Amino acid sequence: PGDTIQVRLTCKRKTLKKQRSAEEKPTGVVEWAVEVFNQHQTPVALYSILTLVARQHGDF
Amino acid sequence: QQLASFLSGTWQSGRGRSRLIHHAISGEALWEVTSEGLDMAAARQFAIEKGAPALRAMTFIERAAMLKAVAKHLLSEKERFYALSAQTGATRADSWVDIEGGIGTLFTYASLGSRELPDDTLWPEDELIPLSKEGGFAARHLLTSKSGVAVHINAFNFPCWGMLEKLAPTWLGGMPAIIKPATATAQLTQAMVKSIVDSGLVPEGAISLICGSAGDLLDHLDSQDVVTFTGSAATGQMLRVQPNIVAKSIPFTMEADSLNCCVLGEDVTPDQPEFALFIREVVREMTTKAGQKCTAIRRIIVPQALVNAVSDALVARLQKVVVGDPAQEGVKMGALVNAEQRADVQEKVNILLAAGCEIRLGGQADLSAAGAFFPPTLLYCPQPDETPAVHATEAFGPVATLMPAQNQRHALQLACAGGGSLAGTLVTADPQIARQFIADAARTHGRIQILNEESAKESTGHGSPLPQLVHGGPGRAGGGEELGGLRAVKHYMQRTAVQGSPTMLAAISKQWVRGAKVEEDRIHPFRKYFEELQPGDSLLTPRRTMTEADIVNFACLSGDHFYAHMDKIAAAESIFGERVVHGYFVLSAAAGLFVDAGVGPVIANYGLESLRFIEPVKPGDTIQVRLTCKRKTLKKQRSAEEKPTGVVEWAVEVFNQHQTPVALYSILTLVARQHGDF
Amino acid sequence: QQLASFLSGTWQSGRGRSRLIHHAISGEALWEVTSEGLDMAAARQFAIEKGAPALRAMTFIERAAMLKAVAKHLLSEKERFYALSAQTGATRADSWVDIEGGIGTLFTYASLGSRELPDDTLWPEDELIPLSKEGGFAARHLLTSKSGVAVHINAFNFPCWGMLEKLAPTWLGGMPAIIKPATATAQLTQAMVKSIVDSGLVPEGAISLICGSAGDLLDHLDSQDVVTFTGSAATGQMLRVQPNIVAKSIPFTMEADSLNCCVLGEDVTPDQPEFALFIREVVREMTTKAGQKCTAIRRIIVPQALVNAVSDALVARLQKVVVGDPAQEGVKMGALVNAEQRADVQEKVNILLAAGCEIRLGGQADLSAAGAFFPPTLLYCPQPDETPAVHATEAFGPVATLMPAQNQRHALQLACAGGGSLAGTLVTADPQIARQFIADAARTHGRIQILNEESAKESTGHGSPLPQLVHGGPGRAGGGEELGGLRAVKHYMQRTAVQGSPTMLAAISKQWVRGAKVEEDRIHPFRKYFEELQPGDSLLTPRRTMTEADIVNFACLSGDHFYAHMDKIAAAESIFGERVVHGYFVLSAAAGLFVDAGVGPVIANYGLESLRFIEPVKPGDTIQVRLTCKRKTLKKQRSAEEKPTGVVEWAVEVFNQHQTPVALYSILTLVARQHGDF
């Protein structure tokens, strides 16, 4: 308690998917590396999330 | 045929040298006007001591309901008004403005008196003016209705509207009116006054009428009187130097003739829709009511490269205008009201032709016709800067001169060279050109319509002065102001700055103000009905200690993670010193303190008037709320199925343990009445 | 000695028949005034084409900062103003009022121009007036500053104040002034004008001065000019019928003589504290400035049983008033300004003696002394309603009649019988008597003080006209109003109702209008600084679905367990049909949607302008907020250490999935600036 929390989201890995059909939306599985820290700037609870992001232009 | 004059409660007519009213479209005389021998002193005396205390004894809500009742009673028998206005040479669409715009003015002033006026004889317009550090000396401005009469001297243009756009601020302001219509069309005015009087709605003495000259009315007016004028400048400037008006210092409001402009911008090219709506606006405004309205376009300002296109499109659109009898089909323009007005229009045209030019049928006007027909006239002035007769003389009909401009710098000067106008128009699609036009041309115009493609769909136009917009103009347009919403009812009142203690100002204003005495009577104020509430009925709520958990739960629930509430670091670097309670949570916990949970006369809330957060609320900082009644102002229960109610205002004063007023504000709240009226 | 006249940027003096200024307390002539041979057309031309566009190029915030700068520069060198005002025969307590009231008027108008006026050349006084169904045609009223001079013709009472209470609304209203002071005391006026001009604060042409008669000024005025008279009634009535004023129809505001009443109530008995403060108020107001102010009490209305008590107590208080030189000790009342003014006082005293009575030293006054002294005169009228000379003649000094009333019904008639007074006073403790007094006597008085024990602690009295209270009065007092706070700056402006589309009114007003176009530019509006916010910068927030759990959590957290939110039975029988979301939770979740969480230029909120909950929000009802910027209005950074900032107003439009507006309101916000100025 009283310990402030600041989060540093940053993009890590993009790795698009091939859009196996033509009806399916073009997308990619973008990985983000989350770096949470406090007022002393020490990294409490650093982790990494996967997250699906739609592409602008498809391929198939 | 006798055309009487409603004076001293009875319909009377004069006996002397009588003027007579000609029929406009045909030419025969079928009315006569005279007021010689009629006692004007007894008329003013009967008005002041019979209808002025009757109107002043009403509240503003009751006077607005009276205006609505007169509007409904005069809208019911509206067809005889068209039958009497067809004698003025106007068409059905031209008389539609004159009748229905005045009746809608009555409905609009009824709505304005019902929404923003109190349930009191008096009206406080301020909130509070603090004049002392301790708080025991303060002031506010009252508005008491004057104890005299309003002399309305109208023009021949709008009998119904022009009487009836002055009669609603006069009655709603609280004064009896004495209407002197112009003797060219007073039969429609007496039809209006008779439909008002033979309904039992208005008190006796609240309205009077003189069809003819006043004679001895202005020489008898007290200092509590006002005079409103509409007509020629030469008459009103001689009624401004009348010795009783300048001796007793009574307000003389004048609306003279103006040179209204319609400026075309440089951005408008003839392939755009702006050009066609420009031409349509000029043609409709010049042909509506045969050009006999005070807000009619009389100076068309175009660029130099667009002289031929405008001066051909106006001809191609105005040769379709058929000038004839209004009853026969296929007739757009009606006629003028008199042959004397036709001779006046033709001699003003002959003055304008001494230095101007000609594009169309101008000075050719048959003075021997059985009807006051004047053709639509488009003039031309090749040297507008070297011709003062264009910028000093109006031909009060279908006449409107055209003149070029030079790249939006000469156009503003030609729009301002009219000596002060009543109405104006810029037709552009560029907002910076409109900003530059209002920055210079609003000093001489009392109304400016910026017309473009988006505005031209649902616009009321240029010749219908709105009852909630200022119908005035400086200089040549008269100087006075009319129809300014609730600004027009302040010409019939006296503004008195009343000083004293706040507990005295609250009993004067019949509204609890800021620091008056309270009345706590052991039960909750939201449990009271409307009739048992009083301004000053207070409530001292229990306390609530603000904490860090309150800030956390409100920042979570609202979703407002602002840094002065949710950050320990940045709030220390801010002006507050530490993180504080949300102001909206102070508002919400205040409403949690004073609002009674049970079912009572309180229907809905729907309102919050003026919220100001003065000092910040911290954790460990208690909160106590002082709910007190402020303003009652019942509603008239427009139907019989609807519940009787009133919009009760509560001034809410929150404070901490140091008793300093954090978050003082004011809410509106609908409270149901016990007993109805309609 | 030449008392010059600041005309056309230079200090010029006249050549002709010259009046001269006497030293009031001793008798010698140490000035002489003339303005013959001075070109008034060139002075008006220099003002209109030099100082009028320099004022019209400034914003209202810049002109209020100019007022504050002139106020500080004139408060610094204020002791020479006391030295020049000691020549007027006034004491230190009278010259203190005369100087500090004008300088505090400048500070008050600087504060009112810095708080409620925009950072713009124009000022839109309305919010918006919708005039269509779809929302493409609306209007709002604009106030543009006039393009001419403001001829202020003052009186001999307050040179400093009476010049300087008209000059702050004139400069704040964007017009240059030409001051014609009275020739009895114009040396203090030229001291004021010289201290203004020799500072570099105001532009050249923004202020002028004429010592002596104007002669050819009123015959040259354009319709964009105003004339504000203050002085005798006959001179103002002769200037009202001046042919150029009635021909060009310029606004002529007059302030004339008045019979200011002071009514005593029936509840006041001599054992009460009301009697002592009544006698103290009458004596202090009658002896301040030796009765040479327009707000001085000249009639005292007492009850019939209290004639002897008041007529003894006033004499017992007034016999201790020493009439002498101000520089010698023990002297309370000073002297009049002229021996000619002493003769003009006594020739009215002799008219009041021709039908009244006498209590004290009346006409006993030496008309050949070495000083314009006049003893404090208390008259008496045993038949007040049968003597018209009491209610029509003012003796412009320490003279005030006394006259009885009958049970607060004759008292109202004697208060209203003055033909319209400038000010009035009721001294009661009963608030119903004050209510009945304001209900009848505020028709004739422009200002009424209700004085009791709570008011008299920090009251300004009766001879200190507040700069935010209306200094006027109908009828005999002139009819025109002054000092109405921001009502006084509107006399120096032209009110124009500008019509058009809301996207056009938004660029005309430089303020966002309800149906205008937006500027969404992909970054958050609270992240922008002040200099990169524009009126129209909008944010379309994401949606939040309201649910039953939202109603439950807000009713728990705030404590508002209202039956239309927390009861299934009672809300079914209400107007809503079922239990709805709290309005304050719609407000709170709206603020959770648009407020940026991070640290930025947004400092504090502290404000909410006008909250109206239109339609109810239910469970299962999405909510989307349209945060758009509306008004910018920077602050002048009063210290060099303080952060530069402005008060930015955001219009907030919340809506639902059907896109109908629920809970549209407006918030204020202090936003920090990127670049400072002071």
Numbering used by the authors:
A (entry chain C): 620 to 679
B (entry chain A), C (entry chain B): 2 to 679
From the paper:
The first of the PaaZ cryoEM maps did not have any bound ligand, which is defined here as the substrate-free structure. The map has an overall nominal resolution of 2.9 Å allowing the tracing of the complete polypeptide chain and assignment of residues after three-fold averaging. The model consists of residues 2-679 with the loop regions less well defined. The side chain density for some of the negatively charged residues are poor and the acidic residues were built using the best rotamer that does not create steric overlaps with the nearby residues. Several densities that could correspond to water or ions are observed but have not been modeled. The hydratase domain from three-dimers forms an inner core that holds the whole structure together, where each arm or module consists of a domain swapped dimer of PaaZ monomer and the dehydrogenase domain within the dimer is closer to the adjacent hydratase monomer. Three short helices (residues 449–459) from each monomer of the hydratase domain form two layers at this inner core. Another helix from each monomer lies perpendicular and wraps around these short helices, forming a tightknit unit. The distance between the active sites as measured from the side chains of C295 (active site of aldehyde dehydrogenase) and D561 (active site of hydratase), either from the same monomer or different monomers within a dimer, is symmetric and ~51 Å. In fact, 3D classification of cryoEM data of both substrate-free and ligand bound PaaZ reveals that more than 85% of the particles classify into one single class ruling out any large domain movement.
PaaZ is a fusion of N-terminal aldehyde dehydrogenase domain and C-terminal hydratase domain in a single polypeptide. The PaaZ structure containing six monomers can be described as a tri-lobed architecture.
